[PDB]
Amino acid sequence: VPTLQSPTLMHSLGTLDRMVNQNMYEEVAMDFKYWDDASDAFRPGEGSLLPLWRFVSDKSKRRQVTSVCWNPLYDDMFAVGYGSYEFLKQASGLINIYSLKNPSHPEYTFHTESGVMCVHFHPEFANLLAVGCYDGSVLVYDVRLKKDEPIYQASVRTGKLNDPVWQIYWQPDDAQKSLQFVSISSDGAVNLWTLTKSELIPECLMKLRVAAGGCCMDFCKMPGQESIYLVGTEEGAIHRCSKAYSSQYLSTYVSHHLAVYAVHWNNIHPSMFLSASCRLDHQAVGLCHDPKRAVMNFDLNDSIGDVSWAALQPTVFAAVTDDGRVHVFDLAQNKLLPLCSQKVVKKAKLTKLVFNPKHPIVLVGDDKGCVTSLKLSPNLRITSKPEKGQKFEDLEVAKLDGVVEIARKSDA
Amino acid sequence: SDIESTLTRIQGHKGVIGVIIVNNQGVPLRSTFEHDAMTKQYADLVPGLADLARNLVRDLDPQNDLEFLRIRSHKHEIMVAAKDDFVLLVIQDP
Amino acid sequence: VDIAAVDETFKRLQSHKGVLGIIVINAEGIAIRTTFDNDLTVQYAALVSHFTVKARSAVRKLDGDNDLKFLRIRSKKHEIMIAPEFERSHEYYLVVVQDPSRE
Amino acid sequence: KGKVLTNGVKAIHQDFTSAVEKFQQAKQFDEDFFGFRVVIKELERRLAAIIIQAFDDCTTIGTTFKLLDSFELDREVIAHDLEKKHTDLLHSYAR
Amino acid sequence: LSLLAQFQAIMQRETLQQDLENKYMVIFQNYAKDLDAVQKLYEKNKYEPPVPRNAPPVAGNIMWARQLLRRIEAPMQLAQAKESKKNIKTYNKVAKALIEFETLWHQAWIKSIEQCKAQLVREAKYMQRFNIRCSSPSQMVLLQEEKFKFYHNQLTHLVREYEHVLGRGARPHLDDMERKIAPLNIDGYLHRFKQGLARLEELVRKVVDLTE
Amino acid sequence: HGPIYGLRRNPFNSKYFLSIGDWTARVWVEDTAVKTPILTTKYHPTYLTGGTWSPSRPGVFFTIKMDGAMDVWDLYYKHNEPTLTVQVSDLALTAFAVQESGGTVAVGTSDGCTSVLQLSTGLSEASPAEKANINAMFERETTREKNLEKAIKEA
Amino acid sequence: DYIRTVVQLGSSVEDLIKQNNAVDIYQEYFTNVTMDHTSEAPHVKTVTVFK
């Protein structure tokens, strides 16, 4: 009943602040949606990311972007998981949540007390955000409550991975009495978590045996089925198993010598994943059979932060290395050379690349606690348009398969 | 401590020259100005425009209401968030 | 002929997403081109004429050398956009009605 | 828990039937023979997995033979998974 | 070089097969160029080399050196006669420098295991799983980590649980537990402090339900 | 086992009866082929003495022991350890009762008094069939094990 | 003169309409989400002890 503390005052003030901040970046946003690079219908063989919004907060500069994730419904949310990767500069972690509606001030925020080495939003409900931490504590945060604190934790009583939790995921549990989580850790291996009464309980999935359980630092699951996923290691190899111990390492795609840093499936042609390591080469390899060779190889000058197939097309993909250059390949215009290699940051080593499902932009993330958002010039995004007698998934299977057979019989 | 932090953020951007909150009839409470010879100008000129615009919108189909309003002059962007309790003003040249 | 140009401007504007309506009304509150029926037309013409002359008198009173080239009122349904061009021998506050919900 | 796990041992039975009925059709039979060797020593690990996941949730001294003699399948492929868990029974009886 | 192998495999004419031996010198120019670039990395980054992620500082520098050596060495198996002499000399100085790291840093690690073994009690017993891969170990290898991250995980919990039950106070109660917190015998003290906090986790909730 | 102290049919859907009497807390069934438990639960400490079910929620139970507890054993969610261990007294509890609407319990202690508890919105339910199901399926495994001894001896 | 005015205004408004379609400003996230996931651990209260 004092008007100057009424909640609806704060509501309309927040909307008026967005209404202000829009009118401070009008060009950056109008280009985000209504602009096509007019000088790439003239030179067919290359492209040019155009840099857009930049997102910094003053608690971030002492921190390093250590994950990024996008929300299923709205397509203006991020989830930056600021944290640490150096062995000697170990800090407390952070997690903002940003928006495209205001880029300057984050909508939400939290403040953990170890390095947030992953995030993931839930796909169906659209708010609950699972995270992990440098010290095994997987956490779950609920967002619309506006209480700067978790709603569940882990302990050493329920279950604790005991070393960094590099990646976590959300499983769809269909209208059941639960929600599901799959994880991965340096010591020991994959664990399943549930969301019970007021707790999160481990169930162990498999152990990554080779000295000790071999370390591992990433995994991805195939969308189109669920059980079969791809797991990195630090012994070097890449493994693939299913949600069982059903032939521990169903596939053992072994080709590497160091810590692999990224794997990725590609949403079209469900047999073909690429991967990427810290041996300065990323390899785009086929999986139904084919476990002893790589269809291709793309060497480069500094080790890979990460890789990502495009959401909109299974030829183009992009990769991010430890120099300042994001470089992005079309696998069907050039053949072993990057279509567009551009340096975006000045004095930081980039470390995280994430695409966007609907609008065509990309997020890349620094070493200095910042995230910067690039746009893809039209030569990078070329989806073969469907027609009357054919389906869109089929043409994009066909392009990749043609490139695969060409370089398969041309390699040897 | 959320209302005043949003006031302090919103008054420190690249173009903002003044934030005003005014009550139903008048009484501009919590201005932001180093003198008050033009706050009263805003407070007694603008909510006439806000409720006149609520008349214009609502007259058409009475399920409808008004929420915000912007007037962009040459050198100013007067944004008014009108509602039942009060009228709120933010002034900014882009 | 420029009549094709202005009708083309109507399809330029009207091809955008959600744009329900375009109408042009002069200083005497009488619509010239429409896109609506006739009575929603005349009630827009009267209401917006009176409202925009009040708003321009407000801004001119507030500061002597500043005028307005812009006006934007909001609904929960549709964001009426008014633009005016106050001059002699012509002052044609065109008014659009749109919303991004549709389609 | 046993709903999920009974569904799992249903999948194991579904596959072994499907595999042998494919084999229901004179020196290239060694190739299908080692394919079937692959499947047997490959779908013997669903068993070891759905018995590792259902040997903690044994309740007492004697739920374990309701769940250890609803299978007993002695081999040289199970055995080197179950020395440690017959040991686990020994330590649980001691505790 | 893969292209040259393919062109060898395409066609047969004995003059051409006496001409595809020639182009190995044109190959050999660029390997020298690569042997230039890696050489620059060696001298520009001798003391403070960038590393892989979450890598410890002593023998997570060995891996960077090893990467440069094994980047330059694996094409040498395939590209094996005057220019060849100067290039094999430049390679054979880069080789000795890229063993100069991977022996002097290993020595510095020997004397640091003497230092730190009595936060950083990790690295002197966390390195020896990086070190166990290629090089040789030292005294009292990490046979003692099946306890010590039990010893830190239980013991940042129960001490942590001695804040929440002291968030429901508002006293001979706390007496009995400050006499237990303070004191190869870090087993029984964790016994004692767990049975210690079960007791007062009971007592405080009893008092709350009989007081509210 | 030994001197039995528990007996109760289950309510709210079916006829499966209970046996919380000795320091094992079973759940038994009434058929001439199932003369053996269905959901045997934990072998405990502190010799058991008495409890029942819920008449407003399917198949929870509530032991008491000679050092005293209301173990709110929810029994479709865990199956080994007491979901909620509360010690009402130090002295040995020797009774039990349930409010007919469910949500108030009572035990008088080893000397004297009588303590009346209150259990929150944990006592209500949304689906009463699958708990008849998992207490129906989980003993055909026992009849299945009755077949095996004939099969073993005939082999 | 009328024609020139109308096309001038059409240009300006066209820019504005793009501005509103670019990103929607007036949209509160989670305007109405009812499903809340909460804390539901068992509570034991002794209302009175009958003695």
Tokens of A409: 């019989």
DSSP annotation string for A200-217? EEEEE--------SPP--
DSSP state of D56: S
CB contact under 8 A, F80 and D70: no
- Mark out the alpha helices in chain E (DSSP H runs): 2-10, 14-17, 24-44, 62-73, 83-116, 123-126, 148-151, 158-164, 172-181, 188-209
Residue E186: name the closest of E194, E178, E198 by CA.
E194
Collapsed DSSP state (helix, strand, coil) of residue A240: strand
Residue with tokens 């055995």: D79
Angle subtended by helix axes E83-116 and E62-73, to nearest 10: 160
- Shortest CA distance to A185 belongs to which of A254, A119, A124, A234? A234
Contact E74, E35 (CB under 8 A): no
Query: What whole-number distance in Å separates Cα of residue A103 and Cα of residue A119?
Result: 20
Question: What token pair was written down for A217?
Answer: 């630092």
Please state the domain extents for chain B: 1-94
Q: Label each residue of A316-375 as H, E or C.
A: CEEEEECCCEEEEECCCCCCCCCCEEEECCCCCCCCEEEECCCCCEEEEECCCCCEEEEE
Residues of A in contact with D53 (CB under 8 A): 203
Q: Do A142 and G39 touch (CB under 8 A)?
A: no
Chain A residue numbers touching G14 (CB-CB < 8 A): none
A341 closest CA partner among A49, A34, A8: A49
What are the tokens at A27? Answer: 């060009």
Q: Distance of CA B76 to CAs A53, A229, B14, B21, B86, Å?
A: 25, 57, 13, 18, 22
Q: Residue A14 belongs to what H/E stretch?
A: helix A7-22
Nearest to A279 among E50, E67, E123 (CB): E67
Q: How many of the other CB atoms lie within 10 Å of CB of E137?
A: 12
Q: Does C47 touch chain G (CB under 8 A)?
A: no
**Stated length of chain A:** 412
Structure tokens at A308: 């990502």
Contacts of A120 (CB under 8 A, 6+ apart): A69, A79, A129, A130, A131, A168, A169, A170
Report the DSSP pairing between strands A371-375 and A50-55: antiparallel
Angstrom distances, CA of residue C72 to CA of A24, B8, B57, C20 = 18, 26, 12, 15
Cβ–Cβ < 8 Å for F24, F41: yes
The enclosing H or E element of B5 equals: helix B3-10
Name the residue among A161, A160, A172, A166 with its Cα closest to residue A219. Answer: A166
Amino acid (one-letter) located at D1:
K
Residues whose CB falls within 8 Å of the CB of residue A290, separated by 6 or more in sequence, listed in order:
none
Half-sphere exposure of C23 (CA within 13 A, CB side): 26
CB atoms inside a 10 Å sphere around CB A293: 13
- Answer positive or negative: Cα dihedral of F141, F143, F144, F145: positive
Count of C-beta atoms within a 10 Å radius of residue A202? 17
The residues, ordered by sequence, that sit 6+ positions from A154 with a Cβ below 8 Å of its Cβ are A136, A137, A138, A139, A160, A193, A200
Angle between helices D45-52 and D2-22 (to 10 degrees): 170
- Residue A132: name the closest of A89, A88, A183, A84 by CA: A183
Q: Which amino acid is at F131?
A: K
Which strands, in side-by-side order, build the sheet including A298-299? A260-264, A272-277, A281-286, A298-299
Q: Which of B66, A218, E32 is nearest to G26 (CA)?
A: B66
* Chains in contact with chain G (at least 3 beta-carbon pairs closer than 8 A): A, C, E, F
Which chains lie within 8 Å of chain A at 3 or more CB pairs, if any? Answer: B, D, E, G
Identify residue A326 by its one-letter amino acid code.
V
Smallest Cβ distance to B75: which of C61, C66, C77?
Answer: C66
Tokens 């094996």, located at residue:
E80
Nearest-by-Cβ selection for D57 from F79, F134, F137? F79
Record the tokens describing residue A327, joined without a space: 């470089």
* Contact present, G6 and A163 (Cβ < 8 Å): no
Q: Sort out which chain A residues have CB atoms less than 8 A from B11's CB and list them.
A: none
Within 8 A of E63 by CB-CB distance, chain A residues are: 258
Helices D2-22 and D29-42: angle between axes, nearest 10 degrees:
180
Q: How far is the CA of D86 from the CAs of A246, D62, E162, F42, F145, in angstroms? A: 22, 13, 39, 20, 21
The strand pairing partners of C68, in sequence order, are B73
Contacts of E202 (CB under 8 A, 6+ apart): F87
Question: Is residue A286 within 8 Å of A230, Cβ to Cβ?
Answer: no
Beta bridge partners of F140: none
Kind and range of the H or E run holding C87: none
Question: Is F77 in contact with G42 (CB distance < 8 Å)?
Answer: no
- Tell me how far apart the alpha carbons of residues E67 and A48 are, in angstroms, rounded to a whole number: 31
Q: How far apart are the first and last CA of chain F?
A: 33
Q: Count how many Cα atoms sit within 13 Å of the Cα of residue C45 in the half-sphere of its side chain.
A: 21
What's the burial of A65, exposed, middle or buried (CB within 10 Å: 0-12/13-18/19+)?
buried
Q: How far is CA C32 from the centre of its chain?
A: 12
**Are E19 and E4 contacting, i.e. CB atoms less than 8 angstroms apart?**
no
Residue in chain E closest to A134 (alpha carbons) equals E54
CB atoms within 10 A of CB D95: 4
Coil/strand/helix, residue A96: strand
Rounded to a whole number, what is the distance in Å from the CA of E51 to chain A's nearest CA?
A: 9
Residue C97 has a CB neighbour count (10 Å cut-off) of 22
The two tokens of residue C57 are 């008198």
Q: Where are the alpha helices (DSSP H) in A23-138?
A: 27-34
Q: Which residues contact E2 (CB under 8 A, 6 or more apart)?
A: A411
The four Cα atoms E31, E32, E34, E35 give a dihedral, to 10 degrees, of: 120
* Apex C5 CA angle, C2 and C9, nearest 5: 145
The values of phi and psi at residue G11, to 5°, are -65, -50
Alpha carbon distance A152, A148 (integer Å): 13
DSSP C27: T
- Helix locations, G1-51, DSSP H: 2-22
Ramachandran class of A126: left when φ > 0, alpha when ψ lies in -120 to 50, beta otherwise: left
CA F25 to chain CA mean position, Å? 6
Residues of F in contact with D3 (CB under 8 A): 134, 137
Cross-chain Cβ contact D57/F142 below 8 Å: no
Name the DSSP letter for residue A172: P
Q: Could you report how far apart the first and last alpha carbons of chain E are, in Å?
A: 83
Task: Kindly report the number of other CB atoms within 10 A of residue D81's CB atom.
Answer: 17
What residues contact residue G31 under an 8 Å CB cut-off, 6+ apart?
none
Q: Which residue of G has its CA nearest to F103?
A: G44
Distance CA A111, CA A60 (A): 11
3-state secondary structure of F123: coil
**A119 contacts A79 by C-beta, under 8 angstroms:** yes
Enumerate chain A positions whose Cβ falls within 8 A of a Cβ in D: 203, 244-248
Do the beta carbons of residue A320 and residue A307 sit within 8 Å?
yes
Residue D72: how many CB atoms within 10 A of its CB? 10
Structure-block tokens of residue F148:
């095996």
Taking contacts as CB-CB distances below 8 angstroms, the residues of chain A near E54 are 85-87, 164
The partner residues of A131 in beta bridges, in order of sequence, read A119, A139
The residue behind tokens 């009434």 is F30
Joined together, the tokens standing for residue A220 give 């991805």
- CA trace torsion D38, D44, D48, D51 (10° rounding): 160
What Å resolution does this PDB entry report?
A: 4.0
Q: In whole angstroms, what is the distance from residue B88 CA to residue B94 CA?
A: 19
Closest CB from E67, E70, E157 relative to A155: E157
Give the C-alpha separation, F106 to F99, whole Å. Answer: 9
**Distances C93 to A54, A319, C30 between C-alpha atoms, Å:** 38, 52, 11
Question: Could you give the CA distance from residue A236 to residue A258 in angstroms, rounded to a whole number?
Answer: 5
CA distance A349 to A323: 5
Measure the CA–CA gap between A329 and A343, rounded to whole angstroms: 15
Alpha-carbon span A94 to A185, nearest angstrom: 20
Which residue shows structure tokens 């067919």?
A44
According to DSSP, residue A4 is labeled G
**Cross-chain residue pair D45–A247, CB shorter than 8 Å:** yes
| Residue D66 neighbours by CB distance under 10 Å | 19
State the Cα angle at B45 between B39 and B48, rounded to 5°: 140
> Do D and B count as touching (3 or more CB pairs closer than 8 A)?
no
If one counts every other C-beta atom within 10 angstroms of the C-beta of residue A226, the result is 13
Cα of E200 to nearest chain G Cα, Å: 17
CB contact under 8 A, F142 and D66: yes
Report d(CA A145, CA A141) in Å as an integer.
10
3-state secondary structure of F31: coil
E129 touches chain A (CB under 8 A): yes
- Experimental technique behind these coordinates: cryo-EM
Which residues lie closer than 8 Å to E121 by C-beta, 6 or more apart?
A: E148
User: CA D11: distance to chain centroid?
Assistant: 12
Whose structure tokens read 């080789």? E95
Contact call for residues F68 and F109 (beta carbons, < 8 A): yes
CB atoms within 10 A of CB F151: 8
| Of E74, E75, E61, E64, the residue nearest E41 (C-alpha) | E64
DSSP string, F52-71: ---SSSTTEEE--BTT----
Residue G27 in contact with partner chain A when CB distance is under 8 A? yes
